Write a protein that binds this ligand. Structure first.
Ligand SMILES: *[C@@H]1O[C@H](CO)[C@@H](O[C@@H]2O[C@H](CO)[C@@H](O)[C@H](O)[C@H]2NC(C)=O)[C@H](O)[C@H]1NC(C)=O
Ligand SMILES: *[C@@H]1O[C@H](CO)[C@@H](O[C@@H]2O[C@H](CO)[C@@H](O)[C@H](O)[C@H]2NC(C)=O)[C@H](O)[C@H]1NC(C)=O
Ligand SMILES: *[C@@H]1O[C@H](CO)[C@@H](O)[C@H](O)[C@H]1NC(C)=O
Ligand SMILES: *[C@@H]1O[C@H](CO)[C@@H](O)[C@H](O)[C@H]1NC(C)=O
Ligand SMILES: *[C@@H]1O[C@H](CO)[C@@H](O)[C@H](O)[C@H]1NC(C)=O
Ligand SMILES: *[C@@H]1O[C@H](CO)[C@@H](O)[C@H](O)[C@H]1NC(C)=O
Ligand SMILES: *[C@@H]1O[C@H](CO)[C@@H](O)[C@H](O)[C@H]1NC(C)=O
Ligand SMILES: *[C@@H]1O[C@H](CO)[C@@H](O)[C@H](O)[C@H]1NC(C)=O
Ligand SMILES: *[C@@H]1O[C@H](CO)[C@@H](O)[C@H](O)[C@H]1NC(C)=O
Ligand SMILES: *[C@@H]1O[C@H](CO)[C@@H](O)[C@H](O)[C@H]1NC(C)=O
Ligand SMILES: *[C@@H]1O[C@H](CO)[C@@H](O)[C@H](O)[C@H]1NC(C)=O
Ligand SMILES: *[C@@H]1O[C@H](CO)[C@@H](O)[C@H](O)[C@H]1NC(C)=O
Ligand SMILES: *[C@@H]1O[C@H](CO)[C@@H](O)[C@H](O)[C@H]1NC(C)=O
Ligand SMILES: *[C@@H]1O[C@H](CO)[C@@H](O)[C@H](O)[C@H]1NC(C)=O
Ligand SMILES: *[C@@H]1O[C@H](CO)[C@@H](O)[C@H](O)[C@H]1NC(C)=O
Lengths: 588, 550
């Protein structure tokens, strides 16, 4: 459907050129008809070093000049002739050129170019301080046809310039389609017009929706008067420059309400039912890095390679933490790894292969820098089929793999970690997948008894499943409820702050707009249409903080007021910027 | 004879972990020295074969304290376990202590006098909780053994020492001191009698450094290449570096430091200093890339780049920005990033330039346009419609290898009229030049915008002496000049093929006569300070460091 727009740096049925139309160094027999439908060039037009005889831009009506050439020109036409032959630019068939919103005109030194000294350029240029430089071109050019009244883009009777502009009633501020005070141009007009409508503009001040000059494109979300909330808008159009389009140019993508070539750094390209859009990344954006060991040729994380993990959320391959990496290799001198630089791994959620820890800084008592690691794949293993191996780490008290829930394959080796507690009671089968028998080499860590006697056992709120360390937030799963991934004793159902509802075994807060009820449930769920009672105002089913005031519905903006009972009801049918009540006296 | 952690020296730590009971350990037989430490943990083999191991330096140590660390070498539900440490020749441990604990089936470690092997008097020895009903030592071993056999004895090493020897001795007599180049002890007073070398070991001798790269020769009173030279591998002097180590200075390293590069010389790999910076290649702009212009999303990827594989395209949207797809406008100063460029393999293409920059001086180091890719109708160099440019400024451009040259519509471009393109552009000259509609020559002549008189008939890339393609007389630092400092001036000089190089720093500058005919000491007319054969030196030799001793 009429994707009428094209980039500048100008093909088949293009109507608007988003960007500049640059034409340089093209030969005399170039096919230029593909430029036929261009109606608007949002940049500037540059025509230099060519040898074709006629520039066919019959439909070109506006040159917007959002960008200008040489700092001052919306049109720049220079040097279009070969010396040792007579192939040259003879005609600018700009027969419909109606206006130029920004910048001036430079047409100089085109030896066979005629009639450019005839045009009233000040009539086309909207900028009163713009530069017009037309000179040293034609020589002996044939005269304008008798009809054209001394102004033409060519010799023919239909190659005339038409004066467009008229003196404007001081009422209109330059924008008028006649001299009378009646004939002001629509506000959404960049220049002049042929009549008072948003559909009669020569050019749009902000956006263009199927020919209509509008202040915004039809939005993604529209208030629904029967639903009392915003709703998806099936008539949404997105911004490509100043043109509302139904679909983005075909390898553009949508960053809410706009067409862009690639997502911003805080968002990521999701496909929604075949609609390429940009969704916000929950924190940081999915970056995968290749790991360490076999299939890489780092064989350990070290002070030379570590930064190559900054902001990395998925590891393609393995992560090996050997002694030479940690403490340095003075012989092939790799300096000693800075311990704090291990926090770069806090951002890791998946490891595709194995994790392998044979050395750790002695002051760090746990592998808590992997508190966000959820998944060890084990699709490549280490030694005797191990996906997780933790060996001879003498200062480590606890594992601290808070958020680990899946070791997809491989075996688990945790041995010689002589001060290691909290792992004795842990039920690996809830984490470890596949057949359970054969799979555990867990020996010669701290003796269980020692752990028990120092009170280094799981928090009581943990389930029979175990913990990765002391306290509620190290549990594998909670006995009852959890709030913010911390095991807890209850939810704030009938008292307490913030009041909450429970979904599955988690405590979530009620909507901020629900009124805290005393000794009865405040809500069944997260949405403001689930509260027992609104604090503040009710809008249909929804508890809101203040009634709608100018939210865009389908037929204009919606405006409401608070009732006696505080329920939002609509403003008088004959108001504008709102109301304080239903009466006609109450508006604005 | 040496290797990293039939090897004899283990350069690095010897770590043996997680090995099964009948793994072949025989590749360790001959190991004589282990720099740093030995770690033996979590294993299930019955005997650890290190018959020849004599020295453990502990240049790197385990757990902050141990040159030997042997821990937990036994399986519980099988009877696979470490029973013997066959360390029969272990003579000394230069730094660090000994940790042998938790080895359920390891025998005899309670019999060894570790304090006799240990060189550090404050080192930690922790031997505990190992084998339990262990056989006794053979009667011969006098209560000290690494095993049950008569052949498995610990033999003492240390001897109380005459104070002239302070810890380094092969006997109790003052007569019996160890050679100073000895790390620990010895079997005699010589270089060859050491247990381990304090610094370096050359084919058996403990030496303080390896055979030098240069040897003094006084038939010529100069230093020379030495056919008896050797380079440093940790502590082993070798004739050739390990197969893809390379030599930096006198040392073997696996890769050069920053500031230098692998030259293949003599048929043996060395590391030579660069000067400015070291050859970095980057991919360019245009066909074969994601870019159709260098732009501010693009600029930083060129820092410190000497060679461009591909092209360099300087389009207008690239310079002024693209508001439509939100690519901002280039900071003009960030163009200086290209000063470091010496070669462009494909084409250079400048269609837009910052309005305050009057020349392409940012490529003043550009030496070569390859033209291995062309632009438009076969252009190697295209400079078009730059209205602000006075001069090209390709100071150093000497070769455009193939393709055509387009220089047009650069309304104030002077200094290019006189240029002999056939010296820059070779192959057939004719029909390769598209040069028109720049500043007209006449006007240039009239504003005094022509080549310096010092330039040759070849032309210039701008105003002044240092824009010449070639000089009529002499040149100093790519700057044309009238003369070299032959008979006066404070840096005195000589001329080689019309270039001024300083005399060697030692000549006494004297008056109205040539100070030197050449670069080298042995060319001056007459020296300040003192002469040694043909050569000017100051600071007469402090000992003849050379051919056979100082
Ligand atoms: C995991 O280890 C870290 C540090 O190794 C522990 O954080 C320390 O907490 C204890 C007591 O509060 C002290 O050693 C320090 O105040 C903390 N050090 C640092 C560097 O934060 C953390 O408590 C451990 N996790 C546990 C025990 O669950
Ligand atoms: C090349 O261009 C640079 C800057 O465009 C010139 O340097 C300027 O030289 C003028 C005098 O000719 C000074 O007044 C300016 O202050 C200088 N500015 C900068 C930024 O350098 C340079 O002289 C030009 N000509 C060459 C290199 O031959
Ligand atoms: C808006 O785009 C449409 C394409 O359907 C077309 O009418 C015209 O080129 C544009 N309108 C104006 C006023 O420029
Ligand atoms: C890493 O992400 C953080 C996000 O807060 C950002 O500040 C930083 O620039 C990023 N660094 C790299 C190298 O990606
Ligand atoms: C991991 O936890 C750290 C805590 O500071 C946080 O910066 C990061 O966003 C967390 N990542 C995930 C995936 O939760
Ligand atoms: C561990 O969890 C698994 C799966 O949930 C379960 O089958 C098993 O009974 C649990 N182990 C114990 C000891 O309860
Ligand atoms: C929550 O668990 C706590 C302690 O584990 C216990 O006192 C209580 O009975 C549990 N509550 C519910 C509702 O199961
Ligand atoms: C909460 O639950 C009730 C019944 O349990 C239901 O009518 C509705 O979903 C909610 N009603 C409120 C919060 O008034
Ligand atoms: C505005 O509203 C009334 C009733 O809603 C309607 O008859 C007419 O259009 C207007 N009347 C006024 C402004 O009195
Ligand atoms: C020095 O090197 C020789 C080379 O054969 C070797 O045999 C000898 O044992 C070494 N001596 C040391 C390391 O003290
Ligand atoms: C290029 O010139 C700059 C001048 O500052 C210098 O840094 C660089 O070393 C030069 N490169 C070459 C190859 O001479
Ligand atoms: C570029 O070279 C300079 C000069 O040695 C150095 O200081 C800088 O770190 C280098 N930067 C990059 C990105 O290569
Ligand atoms: C240009 O240089 C070459 C040799 O360097 C010479 O053949 C030619 O004559 C020169 N051009 C002119 C105009 O002399
Ligand atoms: C350099 O050459 C020119 C012409 O060949 C000559 O006139 C001039 O005197 C020379 N300069 C010197 C210092 O000899
Ligand atoms: C000085 O050097 C030049 C060129 O190498 C040579 O012609 C001349 O004979 C030399 N004279 C002496 C005394 O070395």
């Amino acid at each position: 459907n009429s994707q009428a727009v094209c980039p500048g740096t100008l093909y088949e049925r293009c109507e608007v050129v988003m960007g500049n139309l640059e034409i340089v160094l093209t030969g005399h027999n170039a096919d230029l008809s593909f430029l036929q439908w261009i109606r608007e060039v949002t940049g500037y037009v540059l025509v230099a070093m060519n040898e074709f005889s006629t520039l066919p831009l019959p439909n070109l009506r506006v040159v917007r000049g959002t960008q200008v050439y040489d700092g001052k020109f919306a049109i720049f036409v220079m040097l279009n002739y070969n010396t040792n032959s007579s192939h040259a630019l003879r005609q600018l068939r700009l027969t419909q050129l109606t206006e130029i919103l920004s910048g001036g005109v430079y047409i100089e030194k085109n030896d066979k170019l005629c009639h450019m000294d005839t045009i009233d350029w000040r009539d086309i240029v909207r900028d009163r301080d713009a530069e017009i430089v037309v000179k040293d071109n034609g020589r002996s050019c044939p005269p304008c046809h008798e009809v054209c009244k001394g102004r033409c883009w060519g010799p023919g009777s239909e190659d005339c310039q038409t004066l467009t502009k008229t003196i404007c009633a001081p009422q209109c501020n330059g924008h008028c389609f006649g001299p009378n005070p009646n004939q002001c141009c629509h506000d959404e007009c960049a220049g002049g017009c042929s009549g008072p409508q948003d559909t009669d503009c020569f050019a749009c001040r902000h956006f263009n929706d199927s020919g209509a000059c509008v202040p915004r494109c039809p939005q993604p979300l529209v208030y629904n008067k029967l639903t009392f909330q915003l709703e998806p808008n099936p008539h949404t159009k997105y911004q490509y420059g100043g043109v509302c389009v139904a679909s983005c140019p075909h390898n553009f993508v949508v960053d809410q309400t706009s067409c862009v070539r690639a997502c911003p750094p805080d968002k990521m390209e999701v496909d929604k039912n075949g609609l390429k859009m940009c969704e916000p990344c929950g924190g940081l954006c999915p970056k995968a890095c290749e790991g360490t060991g076999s299939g890489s040729r780092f064989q350990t994380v070290d002070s030379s390679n570590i930064d190559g993990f900054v902001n990395c959320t998925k590891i393609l391959g393995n992560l090996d933490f050997l002694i030479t990496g940690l403490n340095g290799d003075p012989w092939h001198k790799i300096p000693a790894l800075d311990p704090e630089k291990l926090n770069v791994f806090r951002t890791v959620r998946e490891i595709t292969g194995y994790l392998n820890i044979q050395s750790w800084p002695p002051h760090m008592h746990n592998f808590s820098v992997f508190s966000n690691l959820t998944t060890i794949g084990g699709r490549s293993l280490y030694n005797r089929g191990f996906s997780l191996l933790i060996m001879k780490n003498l200062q480590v008290t606890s594992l601290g793999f808070r958020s680990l829930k899946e070791i997809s394959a491989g075996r688990i080796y945790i041995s010689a970690n002589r001060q290691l507690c909290y792992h004795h009671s842990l039920n690996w089968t809830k984490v470890l997948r596949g057949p359970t028998e054969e799979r555990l080499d867990i020996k010669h860590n701290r003796p269980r008894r020692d752990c028990v006697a120092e009170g280094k056992v799981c928090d009581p709120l943990c389930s029979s499943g175990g913990c990765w360390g002391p306290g509620p937030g190290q549990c594998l799963s909670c006995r009852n409820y959890s709030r913010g991934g911390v095991c807890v004793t209850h939810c704030n159902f009938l008292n307490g702050e913030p009041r909450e509802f429970a979904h599955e075994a988690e405590c979530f807060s009620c909507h901020p707009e629900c009124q805290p009820m005393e000794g009865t449930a405040t809500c069944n769920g997260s949405g403001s249409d689930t509260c027992a009672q609104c604090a503040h105002f009710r809008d249909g089913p929804h508890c809101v903080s203040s009634c709608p005031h100018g939210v865009l519905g389908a037929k204009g903006p919606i405006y409401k007021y608070p009732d006696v009972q505080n329920e939002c009801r609509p403003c008088h049918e004959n108001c504008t910027q709102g109301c304080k009540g239903p009466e006609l006296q109450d508006c604005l």
